[PDB]
Amino acid sequence: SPSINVALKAAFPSPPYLVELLETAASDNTTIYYSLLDRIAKGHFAEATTDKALYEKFLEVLRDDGHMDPEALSAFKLALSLRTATPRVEAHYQYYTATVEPSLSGTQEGCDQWFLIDGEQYCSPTLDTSHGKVKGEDQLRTLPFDRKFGVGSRDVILYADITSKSFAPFHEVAMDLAKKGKASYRVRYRRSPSHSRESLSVNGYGVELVLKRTDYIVIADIKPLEKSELAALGMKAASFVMQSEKPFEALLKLTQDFPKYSNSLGSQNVSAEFEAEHRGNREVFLPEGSNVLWLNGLHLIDRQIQPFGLVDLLTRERKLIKSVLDLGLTGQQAVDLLGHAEVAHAKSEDKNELTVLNVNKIYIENHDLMSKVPVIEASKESTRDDWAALTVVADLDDIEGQELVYYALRFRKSNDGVRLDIVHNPKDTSRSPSVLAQRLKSREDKLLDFTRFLDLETALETGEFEPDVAYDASLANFLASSNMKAGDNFVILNGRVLGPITSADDFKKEDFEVFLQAERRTRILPVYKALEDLGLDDKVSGPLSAAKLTSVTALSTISDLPQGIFDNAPTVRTTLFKQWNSTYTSFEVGDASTATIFFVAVINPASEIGQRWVAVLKVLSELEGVHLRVFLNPTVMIEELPVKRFYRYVLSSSPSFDESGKVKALSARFTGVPRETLLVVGMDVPPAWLVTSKVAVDDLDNLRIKDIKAKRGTEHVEAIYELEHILIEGHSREIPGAHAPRGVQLVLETENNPHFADTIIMANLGYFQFKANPGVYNIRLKEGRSSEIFTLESVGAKGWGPIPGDDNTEVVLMDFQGTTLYPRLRRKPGMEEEDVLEPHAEINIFSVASGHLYERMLNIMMASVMHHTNHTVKFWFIEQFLSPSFKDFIPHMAAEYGFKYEMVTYKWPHWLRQQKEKQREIWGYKILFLDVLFPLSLDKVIFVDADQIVRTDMYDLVEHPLDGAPYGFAPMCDSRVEMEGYRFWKTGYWANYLKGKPYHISALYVVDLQRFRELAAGDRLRQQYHALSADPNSLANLDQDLPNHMQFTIPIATLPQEWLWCETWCSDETLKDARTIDLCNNPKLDRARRQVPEWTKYDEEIAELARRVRE
């Protein structure tokens, strides 16, 4: 039974299932939230002891209280598995811990639940018992996780642990108060004392087992490698799926355990060149072996396939399709109507401007308004192609308002196919709107018979009516739904909201004709024709019935906002997937009639990308109302081994439950694993996550089952990771002339400590990031030059904007997608100075390792420095590359060798080109993020390449003058003569480019961090790496070649030859006056005992130390 298991746990305690279901079910819908909060305070959910039963009962009430329908209920199941609401809950707790507790003056008892009213806290429902003044920051501030119910003078906030029924009476009272209309009610959470500090188990990530031995090519103990028959493997693998008759199940089993059955392909006449003719699909559309996903016609991408991203996309697109299915269309017709070529041509440098609203929606809610307004219907003799539903909003008290209505009336006289509606929107509460509307609703029949303007003004004063209260109520709802101010003039044809109107001179009779003409060309005609092509021109029978379709389709052109995503607003509905014949390469799963969601996947089985897509897709199909047509299109061109890994996705469509009812954790277990093959563990985690290994026995970088069978006795690999941080990342800009405010330094703070974190603004589109967990934070400019020239106006937490209400320098993260920011900073008047120009411990060494040999020699590196130094040395490392076995042991090194150590990390920016091999990633962390990795307090760092023996006091290098250089290096030895043929750096390319500069070595170096930032070296390293990374062959060693190619622009200080020694280019005599030896590559265990005699001495010191701790 050879298996490997990987599980992921969050950096916070599990909030009870009770509160999670409340927040997940009432996703955001506050009306659902309080109707369920009432039922949990009633006592209906008290019998739910086993968390599964609690979930079970929530299904009953959601469906029974009308809150959820089966189609959207399946989405509830999947989102609940994902535990989407847990970080939202932890935000309340962190806020309670950092802002609420300190302000709460006095000792709490019986105050498990308490209200906050006017700076006073009350622990009793009676309101007569006030425990204390709520000092410090006022907690009545509007925060994202809040939920406002009712309007009131008093602002009531209930901090509750809902697990105890003691909350129930407090709620009922506040609920009564809010429903009466005396106060605005909002619910915040208190860390429930019934639940334990058991970390939360997360899902929605992927695991990879990379066979690092990929040099092979010309149940199963080793990876079988074939000759030049690779070419067809993708093709026969695809046929193997069709032959199976459990197709997407085969696709998964084959794609996830690819190496296993790799050579077994091309056997038992699976040659099946049936889909060879199926390239009729290829012959007209997209290339062989290309990965393309679509959702209702829209363009889906590789990393829009994180479970979190998909859940919000289903939710938004079901709402869009359901808006269309109120118009009598099927899921397939609705999508084909939306994803039609006539529609795509209406859309497609940089340019955009517009505002539109739903016609179906607005005429349903505002019934007593829209069926009681003066309606001049379009004469039934007008053609389908002429129909339009003009709706005019106007203040009939002012001349400009009544002038626009007159111009609309004259326009209706000329255009037969227009249904004209007039809604009175006054700005004075004394004149009830219902009376002026009913004044002209009497003259509705006699409307448009107005020759002079005075005829309308006189008709407004004739008659006397009663203020129809029902009318006024539906009017207020309309203006709120449509975001229309009182007394403002608006013109809305077919849903396209246009206005407000400044003066009625802007909009005359002739201007209305043109508005119909332009709207007709864009949203009316392409609908009629796309509609007539699909044989659905029967559904459009009336000016109003037509407008509902044209209006919905235009709204399908608005994408995200983008929150969490960077894809601002494109996605053009395509339709060419339909030309492809679905005989061989395609298979479908789900009913095409009841499906609201249409996933059209085009995956190549020989691709590594296909592995993830398939794994997610199975889970996505398990939602009642999701259709999936999977196209398999392989390529004939496979020069190397197509897939170089094993892959599993941790995700479930239905919530997992323990035997005791609690939530069951989701794990990635790989079965029938070869015992002879070398493996590496990698994580396929969503963009906002920072993940490092927690507890593991087996070296995550160097693995083989047969070896741990010979060490532990079992073939069961088990490891744990931690989602340690969630990113707060953003793109900075300058106000008003949008530029890159590079060199700007930032501080993240909380009401707990104001020096939480610090980073600097990057040159590539203003990138910055912070490693944080759910909670309320603030962002201030770092103490100094950043605050001098710049003042941060806002952190764009709501969108690019500016958005009214986003000028808050406050950030709060409450999602597994983090919080994407678009801050805006304006310069202080009359200045134009950049930070670049002005108006800790003795030694600071940093290192990294990625193997137990490198880790054993890293223990030696630390020990060698301390033996030869009488100074305060501090070690800095990259958290995630080290094994947990090494991480468990470093505090014991710190105590025995007398050093301190702080552990840094940074997540590779999404824009920056990543490296697939673990090795190439290692190299990038040494050179690319030096400026941002360390806090702004650290003056200088020194890198020592882990497998090293230092014999000199390293303080000398600290105070070595660099002379205008941000970093200093040790050069290549030209001492050994016999290896001159190997000295490539003094030849052709490296000789012409390096005119006289020496080839420096990326093994030992000094970084004067304050000069590094001052010079902005990192940004130049990063952007140069960018275009060079197109060919990985140019970056032979990106840690070494990058500073060497950049010594022409970024200065390189040269360090003495005594500092660096190698057993290939420096003579043995140099070792006498040695400072550091890299133990040069081209194994190390032999070279260490041979070159350095004291290497054994250090190894043995460590060996005893671990056993000393052991007892």
Ligand SMILES: *[C@@H]1O[C@H](CO)[C@@H](O[C@@H]2O[C@H](CO)[C@@H](O[C@@H]3O[C@H](CO[C@H]4O[C@H](CO)[C@@H](O)[C@H](O)[C@@H]4O)[C@@H](O)[C@H](O[C@H]4O[C@H](CO)[C@@H](O)[C@H](O)[C@@H]4O)[C@@H]3O)[C@H](O)[C@H]2NC(C)=O)[C@H](O)[C@H]1NC(C)=O
């Ligand atoms: C945010 O959340 C709220 C709350 O869920 C939603 O508001 C809902 O708005 C509508 C209009 O007021 C309510 O509609 C309800 O329709 C029920 C009938 O539905 C059936 O229709 C077909 C018939 O063929 C069936 O096939 C189908 O299965 C449906 O079941 C009525 O029975 C409802 O009456 C009463 O229901 C509940 C009791 O169960 C009461 O709490 C209500 O007050 C109501 O008197 C009702 O007419 C819907 O119920 C509203 N909810 C509430 C609680 O008021 C929002 O739409 C939602 N928004 C989003 C974006 O999710």
Ligand SMILES: *[C@@H]1O[C@H](CO)[C@@H](O)[C@H](O)[C@H]1NC(C)=O
């Ligand atoms: C089975 O494979 C052989 C070799 O490719 C082929 O000649 C034969 O025709 C195949 N069988 C059938 C029934 O086509």
Ligand SMILES: *[C@@H]1O[C@H](CO)[C@@H](O)[C@H](O)[C@H]1NC(C)=O
């Ligand atoms: C460290 O300090 C001791 C005591 O002052 C001194 O004897 C020793 O020489 C120092 N170490 C080195 C390497 O000089």
Ligand SMILES: [Ca+2]
């Ligand atoms: Ca080394």
